[PDB]
Symmetry: D2
Subunit: 351 residues, 4 copies
């Protein structure tokens, strides 16, 4: 079977592997549409989760079930499915503690292109199909569906972590596709003022679409001072980190008011320490809670998000700026995420 | 000073009282626009909070500050203000425990036309002005502003109490103005499917506007069975009670799935017991949490809600179906709430 | 295989059934020590969960694993195990929503002597052994261990549901073994004053041991008035319901202060409605949250509770008032729970 | 009036000031017993909250009310009172948001020897007496009472922030008096295993008394590896930081399991950045929540803690290792906190 892989740190290529086989509770799925992610660039080009050998990349797919194990009851060959990027082992003690994302170890609910061969292959394997898949609606555009699997869940998780009160003022630091979904998620948690920080015009337009009331361009000067000035020295109720380097932790702390929340969903690839500033964290005592969480997955999450899309709670179409046709364009698509052209949000390859 | 009052249970009339005087921390406010509430009908005509003598009614007003005490710093004569219907005593132990609504006793944060002369008078008194008032924006229509003071805060509080996950399915039982705001609030907590229960066409149109995906008319048959059928036997994640008689508690319990929330914001005036059904409450063990809460007030709540309106998170204009001009029309306006014409949601009297 | 069963409502007897067989993920366990529960009296003699045919009773056991399925990795034949009375299906959507106790339906995480043949048999079946068993410590008395499986988890769950702040005043309504564990659990959530309501001297002594600061005997007069008098009209922060008839709901509501919690863990068998009083529930608005929950189970819960016992956080020995030797005494033991002698808390049959 | 003061950074001395006067809502209190705090050493000798001029030190006192304002109703001259070190302005928007500790600005609920003349004076001023004082019980030893005002509330707040499940494994980093109270607080939140990190024998004995099951001495080697070894590679559910330098943040992150909580109550005086390690924080995604909070105060907190002591939930006497008699010994007492003799936990000066 063919797949586009991380040969090792800094090295991409097409490889050939054995087609995976389903256990009693698993499914084999062939991709129908896929998207590459900035996370795979951190993983390959920064070595941010350590080295790998011949790991097929990608974790954002809608697919067709081709094969299911003997104990699979709700999915069958031919079913069209939304595959959440996080596919936990539901039989784990971490699940019993309330942390599906870390079933059997830190980040280990997120398998695809963390450590498990991903979706950029002729087929891929889903553990526990009945618990980790959702049916794709008949009329749902594939490219919008693909945005559910990671961008929507992660951005929304930033808003969830932020523990927003109705009418809260929220800053979103970074308006790549995850931050855009954080903007929309903040709105769908009842945020009033939403201050989006970023400068790429395509992203700014999308941020405004999704609910941003204010846009902060770092080229006008320090972000901290800009935000403090917008809020008349009060700061924000919550800051969602959806991108940046290590220093953005310190920025987030400095703009959040006492009692507020810093909610990280950014995958940091560079810097071995994320700085928390002493004075602006109240020398340890400011009740500025710092969170940082991998997106939830599983069937329940996938269905609930899917149904938000069905009921027009968010329009995912705005994220999709590039569409390609055919398996081979996966390569070109991933390299867009590396190279970062001004007009890109997300790319989808429809096979 | 003139006001429209509860003479006692079942008896309304205009009365004359001394104009109130501000303590060091208080304001005297003259109404600019007011709305009557169904709660005052429960209070007067059902005796639902006990008898009263000569209590001026009303608790929904935007006003002009005419006089402030010596220790008031943020409001001054001439300021135009949104007055939250709940005006807590902030120096109370209940506030220290996190329950502003019950400062100095059960429901005692809600003063106006609970026990304190209300807003249907030439002037009224606000305790602790700096903590219990918000500035009215220059361009904000008075009639929309008045909807902040009770309908928005109460309906939104139903959504808050419901403890909705992103993508949850919510039922709203009753689509009077409080239920309409519960619909909008559920949407602004990220609800997917929102099932609104009610039959008055004006309310149904508003419910759909505010985010209802499904409408349930009791004239088609039992509500429980209808809802269970819509959700394919799963029930709903949360049911918000925004109206009905005592029996609606039992309905709410029967439609909520195990682990879900029944969130009441209805002011019950009739029936001395609200029934919780044994079997459908899992004989005590179904984790169906039952909440029932008075709306928050105070300056912070008022400002945060006001700012949600400024940033176009909700459009309150749809609630206002009747507008009158002049103090004397307060009487006619309140009697609309008693008589309940098919085309009424809320009435506002602009003085 | 022999077991002591519910023949049907009002009818007990010994029966013969096929010995159960383990699926790939299950274990067959033979009891080493067992206890009967008041819940089985509700189930059999009140028909509180509907009729049954030939259901082996009991859900409180420590056992020896005799057989495990091919996919079981952490338990093996010969292992001595604490079996939590609640053994969820971990692969369920309710688990994904955070409600293990209702995996695959209301109460359906609690299988043994709800609907599944229980522990009063020569052998019983545990679903998903690796996720639903805990190792019994070598030196832990069997009879103390058995108290973990239901009494400790349920009583502690009442304290968990009560959402106690450090220093809160808690009432416990009923001091049978579940209420006794609620007393201990309240103490281990940092309760200050703990007011235990009950009159059996053996239970009173145990309540005082476990942390009760005040004892209320209903024979001295109405409980509501007694509690209100003890707390100088303030009421309690939380009331845990661990026994009583339907009316105790109303008592609990009347003694809890505004903003407080009524936390039920009682299995109600009689009365089709549990009354919530209108005026004392603030006509729907008093923020008196009413909870009612089945005890958690699974391996994680079992291990965490076991380790609390290992570290001397609670002494379970006080609950065990009667010990019998041999399988046949199960019958006599269960009938004690029906007949309720003054000196009984819990009975354990050591096989 | 005489007081022992921070002349400025690095400079202590006795000074003379005007005796303060009560506003309508305030009290003037004369100390009956006082304790010095390590925080005042950070403040004076590290300049950790910036420079000061002639600020009377100390924030741990039991006193006698000598004078009250005209609007004070619950306290009067002669009353003996426990003064919480945190005395919020209850009329603030931060209080409305749920953060009394930051009323009118970051840390600004903690006034005494942060910015307001403290308790090491012939008299001191308490803002809002009715909301910020508690009656001292007649038979309560003064020196035990003084431990309520800061050590108990702060250490307990570390346990509160840790959001401990019943049976959780907790590490406490630092076993000075705050960490000792964190140990006791963890126990009173139902912790099972409690791993206390420290090496001073007097503190170790107290840690064991208060509930520590394991003691970790850094002189045996790296703390991280020791803790990971104790927990068999699982890490701890929560780590409470009650002392250390800046690096302890990174240690806390490395020992907490995914989904766990790092709960800081340490007042950091040195280092401008507290490091959060990238890999062990799951590159931003490990759901290791980092909290850091000033202790709550006010009358409600003071009464609830006082009542925990009355009901023998914790014994504070173990903290008091040194007692002096007479106002002048304040100087000697504070310098003990600077110099740190092996046998010191807390010192109390009884005037
Ligand atoms: C599954 As991911 C860290 O790219 O949001
Ligand atoms: C202040 As009201 C009970 O009418 O929402
Ligand atoms: C498992 As039970 C309802 O007897 O605590
Ligand atoms: C009031 As303090 C920071 O010394 O615990
Ligand atoms: Cl975990
Ligand atoms: Cl992104
Ligand atoms: Cl309260
Ligand atoms: Cl209404
Ligand atoms: Cl569920
Ligand atoms: Cl019991
Ligand atoms: Cl705040
Ligand atoms: Cl300390
Ligand atoms: Zn991704
Ligand atoms: Zn009203
Ligand atoms: Zn039982
Ligand atoms: Zn201190």
């Amino acid at each position: 079977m063919k797949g586009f892989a991380m040969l090792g740190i800094n090295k991409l290529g097409w490889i050939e592997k054995e087609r995976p086989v389903a256990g009693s509770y698993d499914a084999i799925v062939r991709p129908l549409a896929v998207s590459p992610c900035t996370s795979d660039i951190h993983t390959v080009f920064e070595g941010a989760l350590g080295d790998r050998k011949n790991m097929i990349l990608g974790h954002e797919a809608v697919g067709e079930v081709v094969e299911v194990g003997s104990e699979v009851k709700d999915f069958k060959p031919g079913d069209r499915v939304i595959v959440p990027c996080t596919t936990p082992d539901w039989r784990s003690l971490e699940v019993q503690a309330g942390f599906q994302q870390h079933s059997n170890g830190m980040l280990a609910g997120w398998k695809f292109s963390n450590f498990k061969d991903g979706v950029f292959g002729e087929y891929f394997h889903v553990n526990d199909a009945d618990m980790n898949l959702a049916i794709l609606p008949k009329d749902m555009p594939l490219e919008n569906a693909v945005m559910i699997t990671d961008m929507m869940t992660t951005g929304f998780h930033g808003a969830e972590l932020a523990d927003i009160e109705l009418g809260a003022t929220v800053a979103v630091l970074g308006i790549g596709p995850v931050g855009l979904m954080a903007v929309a998620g903040a709105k769908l948690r009842g945020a009033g003022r939403i201050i989006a920080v970023g400068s790429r015009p395509v992203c700014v337009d999308a941020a405004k679409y999704y609910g941003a009331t204010d846009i902060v361009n770092y080229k006008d000067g320090p972000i901290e001072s800009q935000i403090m000035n917008l809020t008349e020295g009060k700061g924000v109720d919550a800051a969602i980190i959806a991108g940046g380097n290590a220093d953005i932790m310190a920025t987030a702390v400095k703009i959040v008011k006492p009692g507020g929340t810093i909610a990280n969903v950014n995958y940091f690839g560079e810097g071995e320490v994320l700085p928390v500033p002493r004075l602006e964290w109240g020398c340890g005592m400011a009740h500025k809670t710092i969170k940082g969480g991998l997106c939830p997955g599983g069937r329940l999450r996938a269905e609930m998000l899917r149904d938000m899309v069905v009921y027009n709670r968010v329009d995912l179409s705005k994220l999709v700026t590039h569409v390609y046709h055919g398996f081979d364009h996966i390569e070109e698509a991933l390299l867009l995420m590396k190279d970062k052209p001004k007009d890109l949000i997300k790319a989808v390859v429809i096979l």
